[PDB]
Amino acid sequence: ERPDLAWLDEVTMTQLERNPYEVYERLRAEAPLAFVPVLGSYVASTAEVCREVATSPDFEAVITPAGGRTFGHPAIIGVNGDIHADLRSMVEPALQPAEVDRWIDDLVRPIARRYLERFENDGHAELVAQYCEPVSVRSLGDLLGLQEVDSDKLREWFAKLNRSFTNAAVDENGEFANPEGFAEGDQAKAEIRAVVDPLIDKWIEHPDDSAISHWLHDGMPPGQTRDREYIYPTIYVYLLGAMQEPGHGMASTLVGLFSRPEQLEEVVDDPTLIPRAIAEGLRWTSPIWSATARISTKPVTIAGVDLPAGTPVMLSYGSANHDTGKYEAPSQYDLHRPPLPHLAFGAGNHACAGIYFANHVMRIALEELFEAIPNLERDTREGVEFWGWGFRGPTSLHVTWEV
Ligand code: HEM
Ligand SMILES: COc1ccccc1O
Incomplete structure (x- = not known):
């Protein structure tokens, strides 16, 4: 209904999945807050x-429509108030920096070596497929208590959940355009239940050091556990983004480094630059690109748009991380950019809970990769395609080295 933005009526879901950056360059200039018809x-x-909406007292979390169809309730990303406080209290212990520092090296480094x-x-x-995804999923899977679930299966699950969660397209009537696209998410969930229900049965009676066992037991009265239906949606949140994103982020960082060969060489020679390289990688191609949202709780005016109460706003942090108000030539990977704030972990009460853990997973993985293969080169005969609007990353990364 915004007349000057009639061009947005012609934007397709496929276009945004393939490469959302041209449309979003226009949005940042024309309408920093805009109604995108295909996204509804x-x-x-x-x-x-993005920062205003994410931190505003007049907004709260809401799950996207396709995200809710995929995860149900109470997904940590989609709830507020006492339920959110409890779910944050449940997930935070193993993610606390002092706790991560106790065991992260002995967790990730042997995993990285095994795959290398x-x-x-x-x-x-x-x-x-051979490194970034397996290390990401094997690390978190072991932390959670899913040691027995093979990396290939954790990878299949996150891919199916991604596609269902991001099955956002709506038709001319505002209805999901591809309802069949949720079926693989439903199938993944069914498989997950068949594997995890017996594990929860065991943990209820026999708690251990696994994170999911702690989710069941922590903070509960004697002999009680959180109901499994209450925790499953957050298990699904983990089995999508927490499994997928460290792999996405380290692979994007590598593509960026390969794009600046002098910078790749600096980082291989001086692995203390790895954290900086990763931070620029997350800005350059944000793993969680436009997955989350907030909803207004009262009428508000944001970027000149008067929103009624009850209005969802998707947070396209991957676009925010190319804001030319903040960054020069944001489509260029540059290790030597000054270490400015970024939005790849979101903001506010619903900001990423796993930042410290994720950063260490990616750091250790890259350290081991460069120690093992110091002469690593990209295979220039092959193209690197990036895919995704909700979650974004390279679909492959072919490399070569002299043996
Ligand atoms: C490089 C990897 C990662 C990236 C880029 C990422 C980024 C994000 C982003 C953008 C959000 C949404 C924040 C918002 O809406 O403002 C999110 C939420 C979340 N992240 Fe991460 N994160 C990643 C890894 C992980 C890992 C490995 C875990 C778990 C161990 C995790 C746990 C979560 C949780 C629990 C939430 C939901 C927070 C809430 O709604 O209260 N993150 N993260
Ligand atoms: C940490 O995992 C997620 C974050 C935001 C949206 C979906 C997810 O699975």
Whole structure:
């Protein structure tokens, strides 16, 4: 209904999945808060608007429509008040920095070595499938208590959940355009239940050091546990983004480094630059690109738009992280950018709970990769395609090295 934005009626879901940055460049200039018809929602595209909405007292969390169809209730990302406080209290212990520092090295480093050992003498690899994804999922899976679930299965689950969660397209009547696209998310959930229900049965009676056992038991009266239906949606939140994103982020960081060969060389020579390299990678291609949202709780005016109460706004943090109000030439990867604030972990009460853990997973993985293969090069015969609007990352990363 905004006349000057009639061009947005012609934006497609496929276009946004393939490459959302041209449309979002226009949005940041034309309408930092804009209703995108194919998404069925207002979208926040700039750093100022995303930060304002994420931190405003007049907004609260809401799950996106496709996210809710995928995860149900109470997903930690979609709830507020006492339920959110309890779910944050449940997930935070293992994520506390002092706690992560106690065990993160002995968790991730042997995992990274195990996956490297499989290919480090080959002279070629596709790092998304052979390294970045397995290390990310094996690390978190072991932390959670899912040691027995193979990395290939954790990877399949996150991919199916991604596609269902981001199945956001709506038709001319505001109805989901592709209802069949939720079926694979439902199938993943059914598989997850079949594996995890017996584990929860065991943990209720026999608590252990796994994170999910602690989710059941922590803070509960004697002999009581949180109901499994109450915790499953947050398990699904983990089995999508927490499993997927460290792998996404380390792979994007590698693509960015390969794009600046002098910078790759600096980081291989001086691995203390790895954290900076990662932070720039997350800004450059944000793993959680436009997955979350907030909803107004009263009438508000944001970026000149008067919103009624009850209005959802999607937080396109991956666009915010290319805001030219903040960054020069944001589509260029540059290790030597000054260490400015970014929105790849969101903001406010619903900001990422796992930042410290995620940063260490990616750091340790990259350290081990460069120690193992110091002469790592991108295989320039192959293209790198990035995919995703809700969650974004490279679909492959072919590399080569002299053996
Ligand atoms: C590089 C990897 C990661 C990125 C880029 C990422 C980014 C994000 C973003 C953007 C959000 C939404 C914040 C908002 O709406 O303002 C989020 C939420 C979340 N993150 Fe992460 N994160 C990643 C890894 C993880 C990991 C590994 C875990 C768990 C161990 C995790 C746990 C969560 C939780 C629990 C939430 C929901 C917080 C809430 O709604 O209260 N994160 N993260
Ligand atoms: C940490 O996992 C998520 C974050 C935001 C949206 C969906 C997720 O699975």
